[PDB]
Design a protein around this motif. Structure first.
Motif, PDB file in Angstrom:
ATOM      1  N   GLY A 111      42.701  45.139  43.650  1.00 35.47           N
ATOM      2  CA  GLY A 111      41.447  44.433  43.666  1.00 35.47           C
ATOM      3  C   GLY A 111      40.493  44.798  44.829  1.00 35.47           C
ATOM      4  O   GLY A 111      40.152  45.871  44.726  1.00 35.47           O
ATOM      5  N   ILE A 112      39.675  43.878  45.215  1.00 35.79           N
ATOM      6  CA  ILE A 112      38.842  44.338  46.410  1.00 35.79           C
ATOM      7  C   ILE A 112      39.146  45.261  47.475  1.00 35.79           C
ATOM      8  O   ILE A 112      38.299  45.806  48.342  1.00 35.79           O
ATOM      9  CB  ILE A 112      37.917  42.983  46.936  1.00 35.79           C
ATOM     10  CG1 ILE A 112      36.401  43.316  47.480  1.00 35.79           C
ATOM     11  CG2 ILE A 112      38.795  42.237  48.035  1.00 35.79           C
ATOM     12  CD1 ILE A 112      35.799  43.889  46.723  1.00 35.79           C
ATOM     13  N   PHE A 137      44.254  45.873  39.278  1.00 30.89           N
ATOM     14  CA  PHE A 137      43.379  44.702  39.186  1.00 30.89           C
ATOM     15  C   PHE A 137      43.627  43.674  38.355  1.00 30.89           C
ATOM     16  O   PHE A 137      44.387  43.693  37.253  1.00 30.89           O
ATOM     17  CB  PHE A 137      41.710  45.207  38.785  1.00 30.89           C
ATOM     18  CG  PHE A 137      41.726  46.166  37.570  1.00 30.89           C
ATOM     19  CD1 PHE A 137      41.731  45.698  36.322  1.00 30.89           C
ATOM     20  CD2 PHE A 137      41.844  47.623  37.939  1.00 30.89           C
ATOM     21  CE1 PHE A 137      41.767  46.441  35.214  1.00 30.89           C
ATOM     22  CE2 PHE A 137      41.828  48.197  36.703  1.00 30.89           C
ATOM     23  CZ  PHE A 137      41.724  47.774  35.316  1.00 30.89           C
ATOM     24  N   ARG A 138      43.529  42.247  38.486  1.00 31.97           N
ATOM     25  CA  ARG A 138      44.081  41.142  37.544  1.00 31.97           C
ATOM     26  C   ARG A 138      43.014  40.866  36.357  1.00 31.97           C
ATOM     27  O   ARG A 138      42.273  40.160  36.598  1.00 31.97           O
ATOM     28  CB  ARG A 138      43.980  39.920  38.562  1.00 31.97           C
ATOM     29  CG  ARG A 138      45.132  39.778  39.639  1.00 31.97           C
ATOM     30  CD  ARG A 138      44.849  38.758  40.611  1.00 31.97           C
ATOM     31  NE  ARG A 138      46.260  37.914  40.499  1.00 31.97           N
ATOM     32  CZ  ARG A 138      47.282  38.023  41.480  1.00 31.97           C
ATOM     33  NH1 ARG A 138      47.248  39.272  42.192  1.00 31.97           N
ATOM     34  NH2 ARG A 138      48.099  37.439  41.349  1.00 31.97           N
ATOM     35  N   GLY A 139      43.449  41.706  35.479  1.00 35.98           N
ATOM     36  CA  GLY A 139      42.523  41.466  34.172  1.00 35.98           C
ATOM     37  C   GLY A 139      41.216  42.538  34.193  1.00 35.98           C
ATOM     38  O   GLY A 139      40.764  42.737  35.334  1.00 35.98           O
ATOM     39  N   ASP A 140      40.505  42.905  33.084  1.00 37.25           N
ATOM     40  CA  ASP A 140      39.376  43.541  32.998  1.00 37.25           C
ATOM     41  C   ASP A 140      37.979  43.046  33.702  1.00 37.25           C
ATOM     42  O   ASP A 140      37.321  43.812  34.289  1.00 37.25           O
ATOM     43  CB  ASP A 140      39.151  43.911  31.561  1.00 37.25           C
ATOM     44  CG  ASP A 140      40.137  45.053  30.920  1.00 37.25           C
ATOM     45  OD1 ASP A 140      40.982  45.412  31.620  1.00 37.25           O
ATOM     46  OD2 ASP A 140      40.225  44.777  29.562  1.00 37.25           O
ATOM     47  N   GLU A 141      38.231  41.655  33.619  1.00 37.89           N
ATOM     48  CA  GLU A 141      37.161  40.850  34.292  1.00 37.89           C
ATOM     49  C   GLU A 141      36.882  40.891  35.839  1.00 37.89           C
ATOM     50  O   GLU A 141      35.942  40.752  36.330  1.00 37.89           O
ATOM     51  CB  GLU A 141      37.152  39.335  33.845  1.00 37.89           C
ATOM     52  CG  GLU A 141      38.262  38.686  34.706  1.00 37.89           C
ATOM     53  CD  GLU A 141      38.483  37.327  34.168  1.00 37.89           C
ATOM     54  OE1 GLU A 141      38.538  36.934  33.131  1.00 37.89           O
ATOM     55  OE2 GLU A 141      38.725  36.443  35.278  1.00 37.89           O
ATOM     56  N   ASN A 142      38.256  41.381  36.461  1.00 38.93           N
ATOM     57  CA  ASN A 142      38.140  41.645  37.761  1.00 38.93           C
ATOM     58  C   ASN A 142      38.267  43.173  38.334  1.00 38.93           C
ATOM     59  O   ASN A 142      38.074  43.434  39.463  1.00 38.93           O
ATOM     60  CB  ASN A 142      39.380  40.876  38.450  1.00 38.93           C
ATOM     61  CG  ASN A 142      39.306  39.291  38.384  1.00 38.93           C
ATOM     62  OD1 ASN A 142      38.456  38.879  38.885  1.00 38.93           O
ATOM     63  ND2 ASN A 142      40.039  38.642  37.666  1.00 38.93           N
ATOM     64  N   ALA A 143      37.941  44.035  37.281  1.00 40.85           N
ATOM     65  CA  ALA A 143      37.855  45.389  37.948  1.00 40.85           C
ATOM     66  C   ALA A 143      36.249  45.535  38.370  1.00 40.85           C
ATOM     67  O   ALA A 143      35.317  44.996  37.905  1.00 40.85           O
ATOM     68  CB  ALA A 143      38.219  46.510  36.737  1.00 40.85           C
ATOM     69  N   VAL A 144      36.122  46.622  39.142  1.00 43.24           N
ATOM     70  CA  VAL A 144      34.650  47.086  40.037  1.00 43.24           C
ATOM     71  C   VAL A 144      34.605  48.189  40.057  1.00 43.24           C
ATOM     72  O   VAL A 144      35.689  49.009  40.085  1.00 43.24           O
ATOM     73  CB  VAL A 144      34.510  46.195  41.116  1.00 43.24           C
ATOM     74  CG1 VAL A 144      34.082  44.640  41.078  1.00 43.24           C
ATOM     75  CG2 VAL A 144      35.333  46.629  42.171  1.00 43.24           C
ATOM     76  N   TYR A 145      33.574  48.984  39.933  1.00 41.93           N
ATOM     77  CA  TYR A 145      33.162  50.365  39.993  1.00 41.93           C
ATOM     78  C   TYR A 145      33.853  51.438  39.242  1.00 41.93           C
ATOM     79  O   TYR A 145      33.878  52.460  39.307  1.00 41.93           O
ATOM     80  CB  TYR A 145      33.711  50.939  41.652  1.00 41.93           C
ATOM     81  CG  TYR A 145      32.991  50.311  42.673  1.00 41.93           C
ATOM     82  CD1 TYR A 145      31.495  50.362  42.549  1.00 41.93           C
ATOM     83  CD2 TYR A 145      33.444  49.358  43.659  1.00 41.93           C
ATOM     84  CE1 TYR A 145      30.773  49.685  43.771  1.00 41.93           C
ATOM     85  CE2 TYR A 145      32.899  48.903  44.468  1.00 41.93           C
ATOM     86  CZ  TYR A 145      31.538  48.931  44.671  1.00 41.93           C
ATOM     87  OH  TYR A 145      30.677  48.497  45.827  1.00 41.93           O
ATOM     88  N   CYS A 188      45.389  49.775  50.249  1.00 42.05           N
ATOM     89  CA  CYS A 188      44.399  48.610  50.920  1.00 42.05           C
ATOM     90  C   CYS A 188      44.412  47.654  49.875  1.00 42.05           C
ATOM     91  O   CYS A 188      44.284  47.674  48.634  1.00 42.05           O
ATOM     92  CB  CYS A 188      43.003  49.198  51.130  1.00 42.05           C
ATOM     93  SG  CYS A 188      42.119  47.797  51.963  1.00 42.05           S
ATOM     94  N   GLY A 189      44.719  46.309  50.232  1.00 35.98           N
ATOM     95  CA  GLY A 189      44.500  45.323  49.226  1.00 35.98           C
ATOM     96  C   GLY A 189      45.049  43.997  50.027  1.00 35.98           C
ATOM     97  O   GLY A 189      45.221  43.752  51.132  1.00 35.98           O
TER      98      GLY A 189
END
Ligand SMILES: Cc1cc2nc3c(=O)[nH]c(=O)nc-3n(C[C@H](O)[C@H](O)[C@H](O)COP(=O)(O)OP(=O)(O)OC[C@H]3O[C@@H](n4cnc5c(N)ncnc54)[C@H](O)[C@@H]3O)c2cc1C
Ligand SMILES: [Br-]
Ligand SMILES: [Br-]
Ligand SMILES: [Br-]
Ligand SMILES: [Br-]
Ligand SMILES: [Br-]
Ligand SMILES: [Br-]
Ligand SMILES: [Br-]
Ligand SMILES: [Br-]
Length: 217
Positions: A111-112, A137-145, A188-189
């Motif tokens: 995640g972050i 990441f937990r589902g496509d809605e929580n991916a970044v970058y 990291c996570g």
């Protein structure tokens, strides 16, 4: 010494709960990718207590932080933080230093937890190492970058991306996964994820160097 005074110049919502903060500092700041700093925000309606965030980019007088909503203060950052507001920072902290590792590296972000890896990518436009990057990441809605990562892989064939949606595949599992001793593993996570992966990697690969920074999500 004394704190670094910074002014927020830009804010970007990356997804439904994550917001990137770009700051301009009064004087040059020094850090290494993998490190974090304690940020104090001075804006009406915000608590000024310091909170640690990994540095997600920048050099000289520019610094970036990427904040995911995890409680009251970080939800306030997502919804209500304004450009022009000032912040203070102390110095960089942390013993996870990505540049110090071997030329072959395995990066694992939950995640972050991707944020220190984003600073390395941003500060090394031409990648100097061979990297396998596992981003969970937990589902496509929580991916970044994702676009930034795709651009980096296109520019650097030595960067190999492995995107994992843990809602479809389950939490990342390295049980019996062989990681050679010529590579350094950086992670990291969430602390729960870091401790499970570290037990798996240490048992299968006792000789392989493993370094991680975890926090209670
Ligand atoms: C080394 C480090 C690097 C981090 N990097 C990032 C990052 O890049 N992006 C990001 O979104 N978050 C990051 N965090 C987590 C972030 O600091 C917390 O999510 C945030 O401070 C919670 O504030 P809150 O008021 O929203 O939540 P709260 O209501 O305070 O939630 C409580 C939880 O938040 C965390 N927390 C709260 N206050 C502190 C504090 N003073 N020091 C440490 N942890 C605290 C703890 O995990 C605690 O269990 C990092 C934490 C650490 C320790
Ligand atoms: Br660095
Ligand atoms: Br920059
Ligand atoms: Br201060
Ligand atoms: Br330190
Ligand atoms: Br996530
Ligand atoms: Br992006
Ligand atoms: Br995971
Ligand atoms: Br956790």
């Amino acid at each position: 010494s004394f704190p670094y005074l910074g002014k927020i110049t830009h804010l970007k919502r990356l997804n439904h709960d994550t917001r990137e903060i770009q700051i301009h500092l009064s004087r040059p700041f020094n850090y290494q990718s993998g490190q974090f700093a304690f940020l104090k925000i001075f804006q009406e309606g915000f608590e000024s207590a310091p909170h640690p965030f990994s540095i997600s980019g920048g050099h000289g007088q520019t610094l970036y932080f990427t904040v995911k909503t995890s409680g009251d203060h970080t939800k306030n950052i997502y919804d209500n933080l304004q450009a022009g507001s000032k912040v203070t920072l102390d110095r960089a902290y942390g013993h996870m230093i990505i540049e110090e590792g071997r030329e072959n590296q395995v990066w694992i972000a939950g995640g972050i937890g991707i944020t220190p890896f984003i600073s390395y990518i941003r500060e090394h436009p031409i990648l100097d190492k061979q990297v396998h990057f596992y981003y969970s990441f937990r589902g496509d809605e929580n991916a970044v970058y994702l676009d930034l990562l795709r651009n980096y892989a296109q520019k650097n064939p030595n960067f190999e991306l492995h995107l994992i949606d843990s809602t479809k595949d389950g939490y990342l599992n390295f049980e019996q996964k062989e990681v050679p001793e010529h590579a350094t593993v950086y992670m990291c996570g969430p602390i729960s994820m870091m401790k499970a992966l570290a037990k798996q990697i240490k048992k299968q690969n006792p000789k392989t160097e493993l370094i991680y920074e975890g926090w209670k999500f």
